[PDB]
C-alpha cells in the first residue's frame, strides 16, 4: 500500500507531517552530531541538523500544527527557540533564533514565518538548529527535508520506529470522508 | 466564520478533535470535581468526568491520533490508562481501566477499541474516568461529548483558551487542497 497511495493521502501527509526546508537561504547543512552538542557539549550526539545561515534569516514552519513551547530571551543551551507539535506524534524544533514571532498555543500553518535565525545559546555561530522527532524520539531530519510529492518515499524510509502503513490507513479514512462529502 | 463553516471543515474537525461518547453503556455521568480526586484525594479539582459503568465495558477512542502513554498493571492513582495525543494540541485520557488494548506509538482511529473499563487505582468504584485537554490544560469534557455534526457549536463555546477561528483557517487550507486534487 505504501507504493500505491493516492494523491489525496500524499497531499494530506505533506500538510500534517514535517517536510521540506525550514529556511530558504543557507550556505551549508551539517549534522549536530558533528559539533559540540548545545546541551551535552560533546560530539557524537544524534541530534538533528544545523543550517549555516546569516543572522536574521527568516525561519518557516515545516508543517501545520500548534506552538507548544518557546524560549524568547535565552542565551544558553538551545537559545531562543520554537517547538511545534504536529499531528500523529511528530514535532519540529527550531533553535538558536535571534527572534521568535509566534506564541505558545498559536495554531500554525505550513510555511508560516515563526522567527528569525540567530546565534543564541551554545550555537557555535550563526545557524538554525532543526530537529524532527516522533513522540520525542530523534529522527534523520534529512529524510524529511528531501520529502515532497515527487520524492514521496523519502520519509517513509524512516521506518524502524514509525508504522507508516498504519498511519496511511488512518489518513485514507479522512480522505474518503471528504470524497463522500464532495 | 464560525457560523459559516463548510461541511468538509466540520467533518475534518470531528475526525481530528475529541468528540462524542467514549463508552456506549453507562448508568451515570458525574464530574470528577464532585469526588475525591484520584491523585489529590480532595473534592473540587477541575478534572474531567466519570462514566459510572460496570467492569469490562469497552472503551473507544474519541478521535484519530497516536497513543503516547499507557499504564497496564497499576492499581494506584489513575490506575490503568491510555493517553491519546490528537492534532492541534488536544489529548484525551481514559482511566481506571481493567485492561489496555493498545500500545504506545500505535496510530489510532476514531471509534477504535482501546481498552475495557475497570475500577483500578483510586477509582471509587467501577467507572471510566475521561479527560479532554488542550496543551495539557483541562477542558469541560461535556462540551466535547455533546459535539457532533448536528450540534457543531458545542465545543466551539470552549473558547476562552482555544482560538477556534484560527484553527478553522488552518483546516480550510487542508479542505481546499483536497478539492483542488479531486
Residue numbers in the entry:
A (entry chain A), B (entry chain A): 120 to 301
Authors' account:
The LytM domain of Csd2121–308 adopts the canonical fold, in which a central seven-stranded anti-parallel β-sheet (β1↑-β2↓-β9↑-β6↓-β5↑-β4↓-β7↑) forms a two-layered sandwich with a smaller anti-parallel β-sheet (β3↓-β8↑-β6↓). Unexpectedly, the Csd2121–308 monomer (referred to as chain A) in the asymmetric unit of the crystal forms a tight symmetric side-by-side homodimer with a neighboring Csd2121–308 monomer (chain A’) from an adjacent asymmetric unit. Two characteristic motifs (HxxxD and HxH) of the LytM domain are conserved in Csd1 and Csd3, whereas the first histidines of these motifs in Csd2 are substituted with Glu165 and Lys246, respectively.
H. pylori Csd1 and Csd2 belong to the M23B metallopeptidase family and may act as the d,d-endopeptidase to cleave the 4→3 cross-links. The overall structures of Csd1125–312 and Csd2121–308 monomers are similar to each other, consisting of a helical domain and a LytM domain. The Csd1 LytM domain contains a catalytic site with a Zn2+ ion, which is coordinated by three conserved ligands and two water molecules, whereas Csd2 has a degenerate LytM domain with incomplete metal ligands and no metal ion is bound.
